[PDB]
Amino acid sequence: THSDVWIRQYRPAHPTAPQLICLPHAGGSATFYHPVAAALAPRCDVLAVQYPGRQDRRAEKPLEDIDELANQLFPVLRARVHQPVALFGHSMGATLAFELARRFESAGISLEALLVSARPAPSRQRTGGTVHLLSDEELVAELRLVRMALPAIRGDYRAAETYRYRPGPKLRCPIHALTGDDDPMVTPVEARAWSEHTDGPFTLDTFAGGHFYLLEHRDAILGIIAEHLRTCSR
Numbered sequence: 001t002h003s004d005v006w007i008r009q010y011r012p013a014h015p016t017a018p019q020l021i022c023l024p025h026a027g028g029s030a031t032f033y034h035p036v037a038a039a040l041a042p043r044c045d046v047l048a049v050q051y052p053g054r055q056d057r058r059a060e061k062p063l064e065d066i067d068e069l070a071n072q073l074f075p076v077l078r079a080r081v082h083q084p085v086a087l088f089g090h091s092m093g094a095t096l097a098f099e100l101a102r103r104f105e106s107a108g109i110s111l112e113a114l115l116v117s118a119r120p121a122p123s124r125q126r127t128g129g130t131v132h133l134l135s136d137e138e139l140v141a142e143l144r145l146v147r148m149a150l151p152a153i154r155g156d157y158r159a160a161e162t163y164r165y166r167p168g169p170k171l172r173c174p175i176h177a178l179t180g181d182d183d184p185m186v187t188p189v190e191a192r193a194w195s196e197h198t199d200g201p202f203t204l205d206t207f208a209g210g211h212f213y214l215l216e217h218r219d220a221i222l223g224i225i226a227e228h229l230r231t232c233s234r
Contacts, residue, residue, distance in 0.1 A: 004076065005050070005057065006049060006050060006072075006073060006076045006077075007021075007047050007048070007049060007050075007076060007077065007080055008030040008031075008047070008048045008049070008050055009037075009045070009046070009047055009048075010033075010034050010037035010038070010041075010046065010048065011037045011038060011041035011042065011046065012041065012042050013041050013042045013043075013044060013045035013046070014042045014043060014045075017041070017042060017043055017044050017045040017231075018044055018045065018084040018085065018086065018112060018229040018230065018231065019044070019045045019047060019080075019081065019082055019083075019084070019085040019086070020036070020040065020044050020045065020046045020047065020085075020086050020087075020088060020225065020229065021047045021049065021077060021085065021086070021087045021088070021097075021100070022036060022046060022047065022048045022049065022087075022088045022089070022093075023049050023087065023088065023089035023090070023092075023093030023094070023096045023097045023100070024048070024049065024051070024090065024093050025090045025091035025092050025093050025118075025156075026091060026092040026153065026156035026157050026159070026160045027143075027149070027152070027153040027156055027157075028090070028093070028156075029050060029051075029054045029055050030048035030049055030050035030055075031048070031055070032048070033046065033048035034048070035218060035222075036048075036088075036222065036225070038234070039218075039219075039222045039233050039234040040222065040225065040226060040229075040231065040233060040234070043226075043231040043232065044225075044226070044229055044231050045082075047077075047080065049073065049093075051063065051069065051152070051156065052152075053151060053152030053155060054149065054152045058148060058149075058152070062151055062152040062154075062155030062156065063155060063159065064155045064158045064159055064162075065158075065159055065162070065163075066092070066095050066096055066099055066159050066160075066163045067099065068159075069096055069099075069159060070096060070099040070100055070103060073096075073100065074100060074103045074104075077100065078107070081104070081109060083109065083110060083112075084112045084229065084230075085104075085109070085111060085112060086111060086112040086113040086114070086115065086225070086228055086229055087100060087101055087111060087113075087114050087115065088115040088117070088225060089115070089116055089117065089119070090117040090118055090119075090214060091117070091118050091119050091160070091211065092119070092156060092157075092159060092160035093117075094116035094117055094118070094119035095119060095122060095125075095160070095163055097114060097115075097116060098114060098116060098122055098171075098197070101114045101171055101173060102168060102169075102171065105169075105171060105172065105173065106169075110172070110173060111171075111173035112173065112174070112228060112229060113173060113174045113175070113176055113228040113229075114171065114173055114174070114175045114176070114198070115175075115176045115177075115178065115224070115225060115228065116175065116176070116177050116178070116194055117177075117178040117179070117214055117221075118178070118179055118180060118183060118185070118186055118211050118212070118213070118214070119186060119191075120185075120186055120187070120190035120191065120193065121190060121191070121192075121193030121194045121196065121197060122163075122165040122197060123165055123167075123193055123196060123197065124189070124190045124193045125163055125164070125165055126185070126190075129157075129160070129161030129162075130161070131157045131161060132154050132155075132157040132158035132160075132161050132162070136150060139153070139154060170196075170197060170198055170199050171197055171198035171199070171200065172198065172199050172200050173198060173200055174198070174200045174201045174202070174203070174228070175194050175195070175197065175198045175200065175201075175202050175203075176202075176203045176204075176205070176224065176228065177191050177192070177194045177195075177202070177203070177204045177205070178204075178205050178207065178213075178214070178221065178224070179191040179204070179205075179206055179207070179213075180206070180207050180208070180209040180210045180211060180212075180213035181206050181207065181208055181209070181213075182208075182209060182210045183209075183210045183211045183213070184210075184211075185211055186211070188206075191204055191206075192204055205224065207220070219233065222234075
């Protein structure tokens with residue numbers, strides 16, 4: 001395997017393998033996607049992104065803006081990208097995945113799919129989130145070693161909550177949205193609105209659960225991912 005500071009490749013992949021770039025949620029690390037790597041490789045090259053400020057990057061100042069995360073991450077992913085390539089993001093990672101998709105397409109790099117989980121459409125971003133503004137003590141409480149990780153969690157939340165969608169050209173790549181049926185942070189319309197951001201095909205799948213439904217539906221989501229990349233799951 002070959003990994004850098006940003007992009008963690010947990011398993012070896014065939015040279016023919018399609019690429020899956022996985023964006024963690026707020027407070028998440030690249031290790032969150034180890035089950036995806038294990039289940040799809042070597043038939044899929046699973047690349048998991050490690051944002052600054054966590055684990056081995058704890059010394060780095062955490063980023064506070066999705067566009068800054070994307071702008072810094074895109075050149076790195078550019079040097080590794082190999083089509084066919086797909087993106088998967090959960091929660092805040094879904095917005096980052098969408099922003100990265102916008103940048104791939106503007107660079108003439110087609111995407112096999114954009115998979116977005118538990119996140120309103122960029123055009124339906126909820127304004128007025130304040131979790132990132134809570135005191136250290138009020139922060140940890142609402143999140144229910146943590147102080148070492150809190151600056152990175154706060155920065156991630158700040159990025160999720162202060163995101164401002166700037167209108168631009170629609171995507172052309174397929175968008176597959178995935179949501180829980182009991183998620184106070186994503187309404188059905190908010191999830192369906194992802195259809196308004198691509199001229200390609202759109203599909204929305206709902207699962208029994210909340211914001212982290214995907215922990216209970218891993219095998220199902222892996223089969224959905226594999227279907228998009230023309231592979232099988234383990």
